[model samples]
Target: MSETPRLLFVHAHPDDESLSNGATIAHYTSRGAQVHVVTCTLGEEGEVIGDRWAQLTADHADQLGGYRIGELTAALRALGVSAPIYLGGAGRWRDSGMAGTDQRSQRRFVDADPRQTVGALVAIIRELRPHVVVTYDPNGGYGHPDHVHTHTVTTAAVAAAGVGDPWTVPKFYWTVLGLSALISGARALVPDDLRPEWVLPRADEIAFGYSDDGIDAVVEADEQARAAKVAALAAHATQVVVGPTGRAAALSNNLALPILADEHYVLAGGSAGARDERGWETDLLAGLGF
Candidate 1:
């Protein structure tokens, strides 16, 4: 197989891709690396963010999944990524609806057989033979059912891959949010302390991120890449909202988070190369003779 440096990302739902790794996707694709995205479900169960498309929710029209494809397409295009490949042929599996939802429906991703789901992902891994694979960490970045499931499937797939030398993924990284990045972004764009009453965070509303010390890989994008990431995320109109100046964004919950050129990750599997003063890799592909 040609070692052309392929990178693959496995995400739980549609908008999760851009929300977490938009800038990273833009950065790698701009460098001519073959980047592929595998979305586990169509996000049919996501909470509607605005009244414009609120009727499309699962309990209502149930058409949000189909409409979300347009958003995903536009987002990836803005990120310079190719069309995504669905994990189970697009809609075969349905959203699991958070941690406490109904498990009786086989359509729910969490209800699907673990073997079946992991098998589907493994097939993709074998087909792509990527050098680097990325997914959510063990907690799945705040305990979302689908996100946690995606992490499980990806880890299992990587472990069982390369039976006949299709290609063992050399590096596996988990896209993560760092407390430092959150503070860094707040310092530059908007601070929660100064947020208005309407937008200020309330008690019992929690924000999640990893501690800075645990992060090992940091991908810094250019200004253009940062713009692309913001624009791409904005394309998910049903789930995200970008600020007027495009410097920050929020989800359905409307908790403002800063958009940054640099994204963080934890190396789940791989050897550490040289590190800068922060003891983190500036590039995911660094130290590997790509």
Candidate 2:
């Protein structure tokens, strides 16, 4: 590894990095760390947010996968990171669609053999030799089939990657939506009246809100990082819509969700390291001394 710290993030699809942890990626990259995003699929099954790309859906043109690569590239650029890296190369795997559709295709990530998926991730882990690795939890944030599979494969690779190699990843984390933040963000939306076009969700209606007690690390985004995150999110034009104030955003479903300023993570397989008064590691690289 070089003198600079290297971090790797494993996400399900093209826009996941931006939606889930764009601020964290920007925060570290702006500080001169090497941050890499490894996406599992091309997000071919996603719905288009606008009419311009309405025909690109998998049901129609079946060409959305290729188009999303550009969006991922632009998003990564806005986050100040290098080009995106695909798990098994760009089109090696297909999106598993939503949780309930016909996901039986052999090429779908949800149905892929563990040996192939896990082996592919292990290769990347060995080659990149990242000091820190991050992925979704077992629930895959919102229970998407592809997301759940990504979590399973990633967890396996993280454990197996170091067995036959001299290098072992020091820290592994699971990116999560903070419950406290979600509740506050939803409640604030009612009073702020942001994103009138989107449906305002009540505080209790938010999904996948992880409790604060489960959070082990907190990465607070500065103004520049937050701006980078917004730009990155906007790049995924087919899947996301950033609000006018940049305080919130919505997907094709038109349900408003708050854009968190602080991204939270759980230490799935790592030391607690140094923590502040709140019992949270302020930095992901805490105590690693990178």
Candidate 3:
């Protein structure tokens, strides 16, 4: 994408951007990269946390999507990121919930026409012309249907981004959770001294993260970057909970997920970069001549 350096991230919903890549976004945005976040849906169907906001669910007042627009704005503010770019437009799509259950509508993201979704993403890639892009792996970080669709749409669009010209992304990363970090994080949140309610996931019960064998990149955030990420997450109180110790957080699920200092990824596409001791690139855009 020419020589100008920029970073773009495609996510299925609002808080997904912050929860999954807040540190990366904060790190790049603060360092002068043109960081753009494209949210595919408003997460209207997402479960609410507190009783105050619980009335905003799809089954209740059905205003969670619009309210999340405000929450997303605040969260992005905490991340030091400017502008909120929706895939088509705000409220254009809806969350698909998991794979099954009772969630569906005309606006469901999983049911959207691939041509329309992919074409819209292609337009953004053409307009921004980012050197690097990030999204979820094939597993969707937990097989969330919307997340899977986001991966599908982004892959298709990136492949076509170079069809007309030379807008090929120099790097493409599928955000991954590392096992070492996962176990450490688990222990950090559910430490021996913590409350009994903090019981962490068992080895086989932990459903997220990647094994060390497949990791390809690591974005280690410094103290300042980590702070920015935490603030960003705290801004989304409707969907995220920043733990009292500030070292952990969680969604509406009530499990204490650690706020890691570094974010990990696997190179799903593009050329490789310099390797670290773990045989991974320390920077996501390592070979982009930054």
Candidate 4:
């Protein structure tokens, strides 16, 4: 395990890897790190961005989950990573639609017994013995029900997997949006003349990001990494739209936001790594003697 750096990321849905950590994934993989992405659900209940595959949605045909697997593959390819590992295997747990959704009867990821899901993740953590683990914050980045559940499950699994194991994960981080970046990114979009159709995000919409004061690490994406991130985002055609300038993106809601080149994180567990003048880590494995 010491010969190559191994990293694992647990996400709630297919496109999340691309949206939150695509550049970070690309950055490490290109440098010979073995990066693994564990997706919790197939995103069955998400809204389609356009009519081309709108019928595949949960209400229409309920086939979106299956189709998203292909999308996840393409997105991972763009990020220079291999196939995804669906938590508890593909289709084991379904997407618990948006917060207000009433499909409680379905096998939603949010409804799964923690013991089962946590045990499944523990098996993976023990097998992979990754040096670093990453996932969403407690708020699940935006309070999406599935995302929140993913945070809980991943956090618990990381702890439980190390109970009697010799190879406990050395570092754990929560991928997050930086408030300063979000605000500046949004402000930058105001003067852009190319995207006339999309509107700016409201205060509440941008509030999903954490304050910069809480940020522990900042991974600055290089040109290649940023390009890879863009391609990955473009791969999720049903849920994302890359802006014309390639500097911003929009979800199904069509609110344009600056696509930050630097990814941010908060060290959820483990000791502090090497930090820059800003008291932020530039490398996830910093000060860990990697």
- Give me the displacement of residue 223 in model 1, in angstroms: 0.5
Could you tell me the C-alpha RMSD of candidate 2 in Å? Answer: 1.5
What is candidate 2's lDDT per residue for 1-290, written digit by digit as tens? 57699999999998899998999999999999988999999988889987899999877887898999999999999998879898888988899998779743579988888899999999999988998999999999999998899999999999999896545789999999999888887777652545666888885677788887778999999999989999999999899988888888898888888887789999998797798887899999988876
Model 4 C-alpha lDDT per residue in residues 1-290, reported as the tens digit of each score = 58789999999999999899999999999999999999999888888988889999877887998999999999999998879899999999999988887773558898899999998999999989988899999999989998899999999998888898535888999999999888877777753623666877756676677787799998899999999999999999889889888888888777887878799999999887778888899999887787
Q: What tens digits encode model 3's per-residue C-alpha lDDT throughout 130-169?
A: 8889999998888999999999999999999889744777
Model 2: which ten-residue window has the lowest total lDDT?
188-197
Model 4 TM: 0.96
Q: What are the per-residue Cα lDDT tens digits for candidate 1 across 13-127?
A: 9888898899999999988888999999998888887688889987788889889988998999998886967787988798888887753456888778878888888889998
Model 3 residue 101 CA deviation in Å: 2.3
* Candidate 2 global CA lDDT score: 0.88
Candidate 3 clash pair list = none
Per-residue lDDT, model 2, residue 131, is: 88
TM-score of candidate 2 relative to the true fold: 0.96
> What's each prediction's clash count?
0, 0, 0, 0
